[PDB]
Design a protein around this ligand. Sequence first.
Ligand SMILES: [Cl-]
Length: 259
Amino acid sequence: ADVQQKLAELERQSGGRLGVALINTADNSQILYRADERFAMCXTSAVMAAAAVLKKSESEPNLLNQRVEIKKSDLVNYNPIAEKHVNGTMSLAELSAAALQYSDNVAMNKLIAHVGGPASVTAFARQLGDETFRLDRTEPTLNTAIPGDPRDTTSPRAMAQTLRNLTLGKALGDSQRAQLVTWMKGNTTGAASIQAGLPASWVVGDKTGSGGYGTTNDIAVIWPKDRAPLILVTYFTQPQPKAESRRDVLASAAKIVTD
Ligand SMILES: [Cl-]
């Protein structure tokens, strides 16, 4: 009850709409706030795209070593890694790492295209038992995050359950699961988000997202010191189209649900 009041207070102070799902694997419990409402995933959908490539690689050895041409025509709105490789190739492993660790738009688009497009990423989610996730569009339009628009959305509950499956469960083979976890632990974009609300000693793998309407998201697997791991989804969106980022709200939510 106290946790619920604190999240409601945070939401009100923020002015926006907050969605939280924590799974605590110590006792199989959950903390949920708007956890069945839909939220625009923005960049956090990259976890599902990378996982789809990893699953495909279980039947195709050396898939991760396959080379992909990078061209000027591939550049999108934010391409911090791919812009260094224009006119050469990157491997699918390198693209996975760039998408997950640097929020690289081109890299996400190459993962999406490789597996067959947004409907194929969505069909993979369905195969895993996630009947809520939908990836409708490619980068950059998947981040528009217009209120009331169901495109490119999921719920906090569904994404927490799916992230648990991907990182701690058996969706992927052992090599592929370990690779996903290693990639997420190496993320560079999340230090102001969930990580900022947790003790410094805890280990985090996370993927952020951002978009229109000040949408600010993070999904994480967390290893607290000497505790069973947690899964935490924090999604946040705001009423104004040009609202500024609010990573501090995600940090605050993480602190509230883990204190
Ligand atoms: Cl600390």
